[PDB]
Scaffold this active site. Sequence first.
Site, short mmCIF file in Angstrom:
data_model
loop_
_atom_site.label_atom_id
_atom_site.label_comp_id
_atom_site.label_asym_id
_atom_site.label_seq_id
_atom_site.Cartn_x
_atom_site.Cartn_y
_atom_site.Cartn_z
CD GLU A 124 -1.71 -4.41 4.23
OE1 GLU A 124 -1.66 -3.54 3.31
OE2 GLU A 124 -1.16 -4.28 5.34
N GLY A 265 -9.94 4.20 2.95
CA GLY A 265 -8.60 4.55 2.45
C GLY A 265 -8.22 3.93 1.09
CB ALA A 266 -5.76 3.97 -0.99
CD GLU A 268 0.50 -0.71 1.36
OE1 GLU A 268 -0.64 -0.24 1.43
OE2 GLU A 268 1.09 -1.30 2.31
CG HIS A 301 -1.00 6.32 3.96
ND1 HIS A 301 -0.67 6.42 5.28
CD2 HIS A 301 -1.17 4.99 3.71
CE1 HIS A 301 -0.73 5.22 5.85
NE2 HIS A 301 -0.98 4.33 4.91
CD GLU A 302 -2.35 3.69 0.15
OE1 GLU A 302 -1.99 2.60 0.57
OE2 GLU A 302 -2.93 4.49 0.86
CG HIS A 305 2.36 2.21 2.45
ND1 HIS A 305 2.95 1.73 3.61
CD2 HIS A 305 1.03 2.27 2.71
CE1 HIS A 305 2.03 1.53 4.53
NE2 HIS A 305 0.86 1.90 4.04
CD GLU A 324 -0.25 0.52 7.19
OE1 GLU A 324 -0.36 1.76 6.96
OE2 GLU A 324 -0.35 -0.32 6.29
N1 LIG Z 1 -8.59 -3.78 7.87
C1 LIG Z 1 -7.99 -4.52 6.93
N2 LIG Z 1 -7.79 -5.78 7.11
N3 LIG Z 1 -7.64 -3.96 5.77
C2 LIG Z 1 -6.67 -2.90 5.55
C3 LIG Z 1 -5.60 -3.31 4.55
C4 LIG Z 1 -5.07 -2.15 3.70
C5 LIG Z 1 -4.50 -0.95 4.51
C6 LIG Z 1 -3.52 -0.30 3.55
N4 LIG Z 1 -2.15 -0.84 3.72
P1 LIG Z 1 -3.39 1.47 3.93
O1 LIG Z 1 -2.65 1.49 5.26
O2 LIG Z 1 -4.75 2.18 3.80
O3 LIG Z 1 -2.36 2.11 2.95
ZN LIG Z 2 -0.89 2.31 5.07
#
Ligand SMILES: N=C(N)NCCCC[C@H](N)P(=O)(O)O
Ligand SMILES: [Zn+2]
Length: 889
Positions: A124, A265-266, A268, A301-302, A305, A324
């Site tokens: 992502e 963060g993480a 999903e 949160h994960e 999702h 989000e």
């Molecule tokens: N800033 C970015 N491009 N990367 C974030 C991509 C991952 C965010 C995840 N979906 P999160 O909302 O932490 O579960």
């Molecule tokens: Zn998220």
Amino acid sequence: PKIHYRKDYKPSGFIINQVTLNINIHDQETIVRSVLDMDISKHNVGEDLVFDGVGLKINEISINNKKLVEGEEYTYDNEFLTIFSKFVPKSKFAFSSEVIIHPETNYALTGLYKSKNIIVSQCEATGFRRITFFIDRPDMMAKYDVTVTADKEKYPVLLSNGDKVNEFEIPGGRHGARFNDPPLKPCYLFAVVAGDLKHLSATYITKYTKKKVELYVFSEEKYVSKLQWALECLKKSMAFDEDYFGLEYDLSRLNLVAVSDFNVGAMENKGLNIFNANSLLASKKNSIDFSYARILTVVGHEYFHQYTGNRVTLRDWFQLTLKEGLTVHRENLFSEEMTKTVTTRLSHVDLLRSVQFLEDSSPLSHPIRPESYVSMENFYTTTVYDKGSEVMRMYLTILGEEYYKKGFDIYIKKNDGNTATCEDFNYAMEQAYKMKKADNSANLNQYLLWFSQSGTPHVSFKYNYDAEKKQYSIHVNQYTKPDENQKEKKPLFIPISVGLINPENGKEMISQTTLELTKESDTFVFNNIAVKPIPSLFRGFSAPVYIEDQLTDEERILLLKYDSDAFVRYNSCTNIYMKQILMNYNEFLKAKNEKLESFQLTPVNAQFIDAIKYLLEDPHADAGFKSYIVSLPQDRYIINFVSNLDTDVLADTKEYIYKQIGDKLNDVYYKMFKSLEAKADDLTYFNDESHVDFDQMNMRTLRNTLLSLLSKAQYPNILNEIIEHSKSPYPSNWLTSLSVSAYFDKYFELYDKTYKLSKDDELLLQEWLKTVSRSDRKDIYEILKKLENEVLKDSKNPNDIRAVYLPFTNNLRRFHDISGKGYKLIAEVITKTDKFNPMVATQLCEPFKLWNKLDTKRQELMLNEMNTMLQEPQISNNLKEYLLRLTNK
Ligand SMILES: N=C(N)NCCCC[C@H](N)P(=O)(O)O
Ligand SMILES: [Zn+2]
Ligand SMILES: [Mg+2]
């Protein structure tokens, strides 16, 4: 610089039905073979087949098992692979390729990369095109069959999405595993992990179908004993989705994996959630208290999702807030229920009104669903996440819990298994709204403006009480300032949760009531109101607005003492501080501007100081709430209210108000710091890995806040307390002992002691770095140079870099040193970082977000550094778009 616009969305002229991957990981390279089973869609018009593909080294590409020829049949420019249409088949066909990538030198942490001794992916939003060729966009749904092979001694644990369906030996000490995931998904949810991982595991039995789900939590061997809290958080989050939303996990297994190098963060990925280690690992001995709420929040949160992002999916990246903001809202309901403390909601509001309101009044202001982007990686913002979450929470406030649950279940039932847009969510909430009002003409069309309109609304109030008539009126007005995205701003649907407090006895005068303000202004009248009330406005912080309550400090003190709603109490306290801050700030500014030899300052309201003491001394009041009331509003909140802010004048302002209050209450602070010890520091459950007491951690927060107040004040003999505090088994206490020792000659003795306590745990060392970086030290610049030289060095770990620099940037006196040396320092780091990780470089820009809000001088100093960075010949596209937008250029 290519710009993507939301209104330009069009479905692809191609379909990808099936991906079959073979990922072969070697010491010096990874070879990725891919076969895509493809088709021509109904939208096709004979166009070139264009795949995304970034940084890939082509060995060969084919269609239907025949090699394509570079130049004559295809071009590849390291970004797009163009196959001229004359060579693209007109019915079903296979595209195949073999490319070489290099996770070992992938320090951008996007695509496939090495973190220490683990290989891990992050896809992502646009990372999958760094692994292999694809139409890398979230509406391209496909089936995935993935095989991974690697050296067995180095990579014994191999993981990807779906069922592991074969495991096999390969000569030369290698092995492989095949994973098949038949349900369709977008490519950004693909993941792979290879490593010498150790785990904990449990079986969860779902609530309705009684399915057994296996839960695995993984880390490197050194840290496997820090995984227990995360596993407990996972069970909690599955129960909450079951209990509040009626929703059960659908798959037979869920794996959680901690990695050391990660981008905040993480992530999903379906059945394979991958986390920054600082958001999965904790123990009582080696983590600060904040880690426990953080793991709870990010695991939850994960997990959430899995529905809101993975089962109901996005049509395009412009809908980002639909997964989000809605997942953050789900996260926040869970955390509130699990912690049972009022400070959970207050901490969310504190974050929104400081960081997100600052963004929304900056040149970077955007609505939660933006109209365009250059880089998707700059779109993951506090506005999309936290204002998105407040927009999603407002539906629950408007509907209440029963009808909110109905609408949400409508959204899930109708869109499960399919892509969706923000309109689809609003439609589901509208159906619930029609049922709730009992009126099928009722609609939420005006609600949609929360998605499209940027900027924070201002909501202001006037009142009238007629004593003979027993009739009370609240006159309300809303306005949003014009900005670059909208010339005219329209009135929004603003729910105002209110109570009316009788000032004689503190009692509620009306039932729960949510005013629906839908016009630029309205007047809300209440009859049979027996005495003049004090209004309790925006309970729970019921809309994401600047509240202008127009109450006197007398009324605010009464609310702070007697109101039933924690947010209105806290906000009333906030508004008293703000009136004080603005007054003293202008008094200090006038003295500086006029070069006065003498001047007067307005003292802090004495009845307010009294109300604070009354609350601190109330043995039945909440310790987390107490810590909020003795702290001034954050600097980034204050800055929303001052033009041309001089940061030195603001530092002197805060100093005066803290000293005024301390001159009255320091004995009460000392007394409490002492009487709190037993319960706050209780070791009864220190060796129980799963026993987490949020109330007790809030007690520690209060002790540590009071200790900081007493140390700044040089309260008599406080150093004895500091030194004893350093011997605490809790890292929240002993790192606090380091921060507060800054005001004494013992600082460097504690720096060494706490370094030695932290240095053997990668995450604890990062918390130590943050403590040092945030230290209120006159020699903070020399101390940063010492961290760089002795600890940080040339680390490319985002956690180490963020820990050293971000807390320093909040040092109001020193980061904003009028020479501009602080701005110069951070710009140098951003530019160095940008060479290998443009995402972190952009994160390190954060202090520049308020550049056009500061005094003339500082505005010019920051603008100089931004322009220096923009002139760097090797600037990334991600850093360039960000700084061009921030400087209006
Ligand atoms: N800033 C970015 N491009 N990367 C974030 C991509 C991952 C965010 C995840 N979906 P999160 O909302 O932490 O579960
Ligand atoms: Zn998220
Ligand atoms: Mg490459």
